[PDB]
RNA sequence: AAUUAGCUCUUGUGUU
């Protein structure tokens, strides 16, 4: 009767922006990134990622309600580097890595089929 | 041992539970006659020395 | 009522294996050992064909009502 | 009903084998409404001459 | 499945589910019920634990992934009667389709839904405040047609025709509807141990063990020590057993053949904590959790006290008659 | 929340092994029944 | 008789006058929600759809209802009637000519009730002054009222098929009065006993428990993920 | 336990160690048939199992007896709270 | 309207394939219930084609 | 002879026994049929 | 401040399952592996159901509900399908759903097993997973009842339904040594060891190390029948890196106009 | 003719009198249905003890 | 014009106009059954 | 825009 249907969980509509940046107040040198339509599988992965850069005084992501499909992530860096700039490192190694990862799996696979 | 044995084999033969009680192995107790009766919950259990 | 096509927990198809459960079954092997030699390993798909209990066998005992 | 006796609400001990000791409605009925034990048979009356 | 022939029967209010599974364990006197025909209940695998505190007060935290695979998915059949009678000699009532231009009292409802009989047809979608007989009376005439009841949303299941003792035309309607396990739905164990769906995680979030093992049914572990249903407990203990093993255990009430300790030996025979525990993942970060997880098979049942047959609103509705008050019910 | 959060890591339960005690502790819990049944007995037959 | 009709219970003065049935009001089950605050309530999408607030159209607040008025009685957002000022009331049902959409200031347009809303919060037995308190809506997806768990101990709430029932003030006097009265971060101590009414419960009290021992240590990345749930934090990393 | 959450000291005892005894109106079983409270005893038996004590805990489970007496001293919890209600409401409506 | 009462199907978007019945209907969007549902849904007339 | 120990299985066959020649309804249709 | 390099070693690969070990690399990355393993990884399957004639003991929606969760063999079409949300055609066409067709009747006296065999795919490369043992049951017909239906199977992965879930187990698990205490056994000389346990018979868990990571984990992924199990892990690895593209393509354009 | 008495299911004066699995489900009764229920205007009546 | 029915029993369809005893050609059976609408019905495999 | 009585069953309050 009142069932969502299930692909709000990961379709945007009209209007609904990805990801959105709000500077926060608090301290300086910190960001909240609001991703929309996501959950715990990027939210873990960018927050560890962001944790492994030294210049990251702060990282840490929340999911407000399971029942809305949204996450938090706020970050804090030290000084002369753009909490952005984190960001958007964090996203290129994830990339490399898993490209890495997917052509060493690839090799495995491929010694593995010929004994 | 024999009555178990024919009522192992029952719905194959004849033999039932009222020739069970035919036999006067078992028995209808009521509430007031359950007053003068004295029961063992098990046998060997409660009837052994 | 009929056999469920996945397995509730895992996901595993088990849908294939009810005919195949019974006779093993009715071929003289323990209910663990037809388990086992279907290839159910976790319990939770085990618990899918030993517990389950089949009922259209007795709904098809009736005649249709068209014909 | 919305009675204030409570004895006839309780467990009594000749309820053994009976009646069952655990099903009774929740409601405003509870004890004054039970089940037969699975072995309790009632006795359909006979001529006694 | 309340009984064999419900194909048949034209009843109100039938609810029957999808896959009835027999008990993992069984008491010997169920053998004589029947129960092992007719079942009412699914084996889950059911985890203690707190997981994410939508289970914490007498709440359970259902696993969506299952309930997609058919898991407590059920069936509800609604009946409706009508049949069409000799009210007296200016009164006569009689099912056609009502036209637009003959009947002076009409409303908004639409009647081509229903076929020229005056009686909807099998397979037809139908919904609240859709008119399904069509019965007229008259006066030139007014409506007298019955309606599908509010916020009901099935699909026609049967349609019946005949006649009563008195030799007149009369119909019965059976209407089915899926029910799937939403949050707000009530499911009991054999103990006692109501609740409510809190909330439905997906596979992938759910807590798994060393295998890809993940619960169906999470229950918090506060409903255990207040209420001593240690039978809950030694009942999940030993559907581990009867699964891994490959027979159906025994619980016969008083056997004295069973205890706890003779369980957890078989238990351990089979590469598991002998006590029933187990090591769980937590779904959301893949790490461990530092207290092991009591986690078996345990028999649960749905409840016929689903959510969506109980939820109700107003504003401004109809009104009484006598005291111009809002009406009940 | 934060409470709730942790418990994700900390985790709780409860199972049969939290019932169970050492093997010694049922000896006493035998032991004290034995006693109990013994002094009643007593009481009876004084009364007898 | 005439003494019948009036006599006790269900009589016209026990029945119908020292108590009656009331518009605006909706009643469905009850599940937990520990994301929400103690003075929130989350209700479904419908019956939100369905229930009304009547607002008074003015210059600050035209252009929103202008628009609710648009989306009409069929998407959720909407309104379902609209009251001119000389008592006169449209029908947004019957999706009626345009010219009957203009509003003009001394309106009322009946909107769907929407996150923000107040509402008393009420459980059947009624026994103290601590069943009937005020909440602020939040409308969640599925179809059953969600409660944080503090405020479980003043209904006596159960979570295992307890229903509950949900009043909406009609006026701004009275939703005002139930804001300055009757939340419930107001009846945190009861004047019975003079202690609190709320407490923690359940798993939270038995992990707080776990939680400050002596021997509980956490690392920097637990520490930032428990951080970011405190709403009341200042965005200071305290010393190790 | 410790945390308050849920249980208390009696629930573990009962749990572990013993039931205890059964009472019903404050008192330990009563003679319902003549001289004794079931059929399985002798009459005039005052000793403990005879009388309503359960002796095992709820781990080891009760022996027949002692599960009828445990469904006795249970059923008066379920008469009372349904006839405590009514007996409470009119007191409160009255106090109002 | 012509529309009402018409055995519609979606056309586009995430409901796309999806056929039900147009109870109400505007001359922007129209509101459909679903055969294969227990829910009334409201979609552009654009996306939406009569059938039969 | 006497059943030692092997009395389980005997006390479970004359209870099948017993509901095989008796239903769960007895009494309602002996009551009727009288 | 950069990323580390993991490595890979399949100890088995069979056509069910593969078994794996990944090494260098956080729990974070490799938990969002198993998790992109169950829910993200698009597989097709049947999603759209028309009844013309049914006859059966069971309802129409219990058979659409059956159809749904039959696997088919789906390896290299679903690189191929577009998203039925994304295709711009009116009604399904070739590229962007599978039509099956079903017709079944019982006339002789013995009942008719209507199975996964009975479906007849318009294209060769998705049938279900009777390719080459019985199959997956579908319904008991009796004498005099028919069946017929078509079927659309489409593009989708499991965090919609689990019909589109790939896989059947995946066993994720790293320090099988309780070597860094992230569980606490309250006597460990009670547990079983693990199938991975580097240690000797003597003792029950390694000793504490202080200065520890999780590293090492162990996947055993075990496939449904629709896709190999290694073209589920490539699959999986090409989706994150997608999802993760296109998270950084938006925060690009956010970033320029911020 | 007097008048008529409805009869219980099952009883030895109804139809479904000694009929078979076989017999029963030819007739779209169910063979585990316990009888002991009368059918009063269509709908399933039982007397309460 | 005429709508068909299925007869209980017989399972014979038969032609039965609007305002006519509710019987069977042969067999002179009581209960007919509707037969299935012939719209179509699409029902989503979730 | 088509009614009222009566009866029964059932849900939550059974915390200690
Ligand atoms: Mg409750
Ligand atoms: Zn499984
Ligand atoms: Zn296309
Ligand atoms: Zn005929």
């Not at chain 5, 026609?156 to 396990?181: A, H, W």
């Not at chain 7, 957002?77 to 009331?89: E, M, Q, S, T």
């Amino acid at each position: 009767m009142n069932a969502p249907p299930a692909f709000e969980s990961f379709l945007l509509f009209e209007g609904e922006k990805k990801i959105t940046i709000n500077k926060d107040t608090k301290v300086p040198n910190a960001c909240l990134f609001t991703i929309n339509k996501e959950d715990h599988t990027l939210g873990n992965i960018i927050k560890s990622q962001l944790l492994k850069d030294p210049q990251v005084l702060f990282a840490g992501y929340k999911v407000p309600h399971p029942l809305e499909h949204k996450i938090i992530i706020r970050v804090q860096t030290t000084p002369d580097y753009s909490p952005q700039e984190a960001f958007t490192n964090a996203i290129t190694d994830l990339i490399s890595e898993l490209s890495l990862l997917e052509e060493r799996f690839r090799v495995a696979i491929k010694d593995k089929q010929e004994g | 041992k024999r009555h178990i044995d024919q009522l192992k084999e029952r719905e194959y033969n004849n033999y039932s539970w009222q020739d069970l009680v035919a036999s006067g192995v078992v028995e209808y107790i009521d509430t007031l006659e359950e007053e003068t009766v004295m029961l063992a919950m098990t046998p060997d259990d409660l009837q052994e020395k | 009522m009929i056999i469920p096509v996945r397995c509730f927990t895992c996901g595993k198809i088990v849908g294939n294996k009810w005919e195949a459960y019974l006779g093993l079954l009715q071929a003289e092997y323990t209910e663990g050992d037809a388990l086992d030699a279907l290839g159910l390993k976790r319990y939770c798909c085990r618990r899918m064909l030993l517990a389950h209990v089949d009922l259209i066998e007795k709904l098809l005992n009736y005649a249709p009502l068209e014909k | 009903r919305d009675g204030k006796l409570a004895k006839p609400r309780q467990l009594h001990n000749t309820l053994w084998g009976m009646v069952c000791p655990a099903e009774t409605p929740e409601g405003h009925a509870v004890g004054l409404v039970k089940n037969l034990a699975l072995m309790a048979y009632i006795s359909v009356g006979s001529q006694p001459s | 499945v309340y009984i064999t022939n419900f194909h048949v029967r034209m009843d109100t209010l039938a609810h029957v589910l999808y896959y009835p599974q027999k008990p993992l364990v069984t008491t010997r006197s169920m053998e004589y019920l029947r129960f092992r025909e007719l079942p009412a209940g699914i084996n889950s695998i059911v985890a203690i634990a707190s997981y994410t505190g939508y289970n914490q007060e007498d709440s359970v935290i259902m696993n969506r992934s299952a309930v997609d695979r058919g898991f407590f998915r059920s069936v509800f059949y609604r009946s409706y009667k009508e049949q069409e009678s000799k009210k007296g000699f200016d009164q006569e009532e009689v099912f056609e389709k009502p036209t637009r231009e003959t009947c002076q009292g009409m409303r908004h409802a639409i009647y081509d839904k229903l076929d020229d009989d005056g009686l909807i047809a099998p397979g037809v979608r139908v919904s609240g405040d859709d008119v399904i007989i069509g019965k007229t009376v008259t006066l030139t005439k007014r409506d007298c047609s019955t309606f599908l009841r509010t916020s009901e949303t099935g699909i026609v299941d049967q349609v019946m025709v005949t006649l009563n003792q008195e030799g007149y035309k009369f119909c019965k309607i059976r209407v089915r509807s899926v029910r799937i396990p939403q949050i707000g739905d009530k499911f009991a164990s054999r103990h006692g141990q109501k609740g409510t769906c809190g909330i439905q995680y997906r596979q992938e979030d759910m807590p798994f063990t060393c295998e890809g093992i993940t619960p169906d049914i999470i229950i918090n572990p506060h409903a255990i020590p207040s209420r001593m249903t240690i039978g809950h407990l030694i009942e999940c203990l030993q559907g581990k057993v009867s699964a891994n093993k490959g027979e159906i255990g025994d619980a016969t009430p008083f056997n004295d053949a069973v205890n706890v300790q003779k369980i957890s030996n078989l238990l351990s025979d089979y590469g598991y904590h002998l006590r029933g525990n187990e090591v769980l993942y937590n779904g959301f970060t893949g790490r461990k959790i530092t207290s092991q997880i009591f986690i078996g098979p345990t028999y649960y049942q749905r409840l016929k006290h689903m959510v969506d047959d109980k939820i109700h609103s107003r504003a401004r509705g109809p009104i009484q008659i006598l005291n111009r008050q809002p009406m009940e019910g | 929340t934060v409470i709730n959060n942790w418990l994700l890591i900390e985790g709780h339960t409860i199972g049969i092994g939290d019932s169970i005690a050492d093997s010694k502790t049922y000896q006493d819990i035998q032991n004290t029944i034995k006693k109990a049944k013994q002094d009643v007995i007593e009481v009876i037959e004084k009364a007898h | 008789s005439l003494k019948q009709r009036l006599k006790g219970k269900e009589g016209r003065v026990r029945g119908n006058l020292m108590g009656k049935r009331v518009d605006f009001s909706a009643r469905t089950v009850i599940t937990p929600d520990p994301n929400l605050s103690i003075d929130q309530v989350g209700v479904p999408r419908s019956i939100a759809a369905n229930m009304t607030f009547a607002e008074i159209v003015t210059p600050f607040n035209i252009d929103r209802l202008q628009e609710l008025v648009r989306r009409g009685n069929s998407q959720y957002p909407g309104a379902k009637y609209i009251i001119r000022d000389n008592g006169d009331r449209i029908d947004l049902r019957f999706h009626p000519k345009p010219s009957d959409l203009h509003l003009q200031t001394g309106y009322k347009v009946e909107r769907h009730m929407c996150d923000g809303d107040i509402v008393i919060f009420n459980r059947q037995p009624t026994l103290h002054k601590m069943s009937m308190m005020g909440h602020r809506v939040r409308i969640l997806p599925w179809s059953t009222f969600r409660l944080n768990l503090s405020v479980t101990t003043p209904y006596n709430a159960d979570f295992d098929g307890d229903e509950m029932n949900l009043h909406l003030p009609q006026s701004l006097e009275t939703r005002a009065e139930i804001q300055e009265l009757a939340m419930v971060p107001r009846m945190i101590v009861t004047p019975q006993s003079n202690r609190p009414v709320m407490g923690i419960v359940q798993d939270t009290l038995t992990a707080v428990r776990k939680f400050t021992k002596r021997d509980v240590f956490l690392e920097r990345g637990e520490v930032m993920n428990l951080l970011m749930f405190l709403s009341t934090w200042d965005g200071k990393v305290p010393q190790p | 336990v410790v945390s308050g959450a849920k249980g208390s000291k009696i629930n573990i005892s009962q749990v572990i160690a013993v039931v205890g005894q059964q009472n019903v109106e404050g008192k330990r079983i009563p003679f319902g048939f003549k001289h004794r409270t079931l059929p399985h005893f002798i009459k005039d038996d005052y000793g403990p199992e005879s009388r309503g004590f359960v002796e095992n805990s709820y781990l080891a489970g009760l022996t027949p007896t002692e599960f009828f007496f445990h469904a006795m001293g249970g059923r008066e919890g379920l008469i009372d709270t349904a006839v405590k209600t009514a007996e409470t409401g009119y007191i409160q409506r009255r106090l109002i | 309207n012509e529309l009402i009462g018409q055995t519609v199907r979606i056309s586009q978007g995430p409901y796309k394939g999806y056929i039900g019945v147009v109870k109400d209907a505007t001359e922007s969007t129209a509101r459909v219930e679903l055969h294969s549902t227990c829910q009334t849904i409201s979609v552009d007339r654009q996306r939406l084609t009569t059938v039969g | 002879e006497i059943t030692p120990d092997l009395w389980q299985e005997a006390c479970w066959i004359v209870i099948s026994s017993y509901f095989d020649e008796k239903g769960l309804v007895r009494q309602q249709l002996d009551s009727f049929d009288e | 401040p950069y990323a580390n390099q993991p490595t890979v070693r399949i100890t088995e690969l069979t056509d069910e399952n593969v078994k794996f070990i990944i090494e260098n690399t956080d729990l974070a990355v490799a938990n969002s592996i198993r998790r992109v393993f169950i829910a993200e990884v698009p597989i097709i399957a049947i999603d759209w159901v028309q009844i013309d004639a049914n006859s059966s003991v069971l309802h129409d929606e219990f058979i659409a509900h059956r159809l749904g969760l039959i696997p088919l063999t789906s390896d290299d079409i679903v690189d191929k399908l577009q998203y039925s949300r994304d295709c711009t055609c009116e009604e399904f066409c070739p590229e962007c759903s599978v039509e099956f067709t079903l017709d079944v009747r019982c006339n002789e006296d013995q009942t008719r097993h209507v199975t996964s065999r009975d479906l007849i795919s318009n294209s060769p490369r998705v049938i279900p997973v009777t390719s080459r043992q019985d199959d997956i049951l579908i319904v008991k017909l009796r004498k005099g009842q028919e069946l017929r239906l078509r079927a659309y199977a489409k593009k989708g992965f499991g965090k919609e339904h689990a019909k589109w879930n790939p896989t059947a187990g995946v066993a994720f698990e790293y320090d099988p040594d309780n070597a860094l205490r992230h569980t606490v056994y309250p006597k460990p000389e009670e547990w079983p060891k693990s199938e991975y346990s580097e240690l000797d018979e003597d003792e029950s868990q390694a000793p504490y190390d202080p200065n520890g990571k999780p590293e090492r984990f162990y996947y055993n992924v075990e496939s449904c029948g629709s896709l190999r199990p290694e073209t589920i892990v490539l699959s999986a690895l090409s989706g994150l890196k997608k999802k993760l593209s296109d998270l950084q393509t938006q925060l690009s354009h956010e970033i320029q106009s911020d | 003719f007097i008048g008529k008495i409805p009869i219980m299911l099952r009883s030895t004066y109804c139809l479904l009198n000694g009929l078979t699995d076989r017999d029963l489900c030819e007739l779209n009764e169910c063979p585990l249905d316990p009888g002991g229920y009368f059918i009063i205007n269509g709908s399933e009546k039982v007397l309460i003890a | 014009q005429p709508m068909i029915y299925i007869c209980g029993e017989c399972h014979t369809e038969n032609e039965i106009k609007s305002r006519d005893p509710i019987r069977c050609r042969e067999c002179g059976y009581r209960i007919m059954y509707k037969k299935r609408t012939k719209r179509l019905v699409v029902f989503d495999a979730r």
